[PDB]
């Protein structure tokens, strides 16, 4: 129905929606790692094993995606991970459409673009990151060193790896709470449960594919 | 809470190289008992061989 939004001012104006939505999901991340951090025990105990089968498959992405060198940027990656996830899970299955804002719904950090294309300048601060500081600071990833005609290809190249990583991820999860509520206005809540599945299904992969990716992009920055 | 999964990781895993680590040191404590049982023996039977045939 709606793609507005109200923002608050500090002199400039920045959306309000955001701001609350990913403080939630600050709010549930600390809030559950700070109770599965405090009594461990040498055997996984009820409830920390699943922290901990996440934090091994954040391990192997990285590994996989990056190297031997993959214990650096663990927790860079898992946060790719878990935000983007906890993101789209929150806006998926946590009931606000009973919230009602000064103007605007609230369903996730990721709709407003803004989330995704700060996700994507981080990584790519990230892999910038790892291509200064691992190589020699005069060149990184973008020399033509194959062919010198094959710089404009590169240099076009560079720009579209964070416009794709940062599009890919927010049209998706707008287009997916799109068509949760334009359904819903056509008809009522028990028709469209299975189409949510399936965004929902969507909504865990294009988190999964974002952090997978981005840890790819770093490996491109080390080689 | 990373942290935290590790700790409780490398205990386990302490735990079993230091089991494995004990096992390997009584093998060697047995092997060592053995050999020594055999000097013993041995050594004694040479040792009246020898004296036996200067006796002799």
Do not use: C
């Amino acid at each position: 129905v709606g793609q507005h939004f109200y923002w608050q001012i500090g002199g400039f104006q920045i959306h309000g929606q955001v701001l609350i939505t990913s403080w939630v999901v600050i709010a549930i991340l600390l809030g559950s790692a700070a109770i599965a951090v405090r009594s461990p025990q040498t055997i996984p105990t009820g409830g920390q094993n699943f922290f901990e089968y996440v934090l091994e498959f954040i391990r192997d992405v990285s590994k996989t995606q990056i190297g031997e060198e993959y214990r650096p940027w663990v927790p860079f990656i898992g946060t790719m991970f878990l935000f983007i996830f906890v993101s789209n899970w929150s806006g998926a299955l946590l009931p606000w459409k009973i919230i009602q804002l000064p103007h605007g719904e609230l369903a996730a950090p990721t709709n407003d673009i803004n989330t995704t294309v700060a996700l994507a300048l981080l990584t790519s601060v990230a892999y910038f990151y790892a291509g200064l500081t691992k190589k020699g600071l005069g060149y990184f990833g973008k020399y033509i060193q194959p062919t010198p005609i094959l710089l404009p290809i590169n240099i076009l190249e560079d720009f579209t790896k964070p416009l794709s990583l940062s599009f890919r991820l927010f049209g998706n999860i707008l287009a997916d709470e799109l068509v949760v509520v334009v359904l819903v206005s056509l008809v009522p809540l028990v028709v469209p449960i299975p189409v949510m599945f399936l965004g929902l299904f969507t909504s865990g992969i294009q988190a999964l594919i974002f952090a997978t990716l981005a840890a790819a992009y770093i490996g491109e920055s080390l080689e | 809470l990373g942290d935290f999964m590790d700790k409780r990781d490398a205990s386990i895993k302490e735990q079993l190289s230091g089991v494995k680590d004990t096992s390997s040191e009584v093998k060697q404590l047995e092997e060592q008992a053995n050999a020594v049982m055999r000097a013993a023996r041995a050594e004694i039977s040479a040792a009246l061989n020898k004296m036996k045939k200067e006796t002799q």
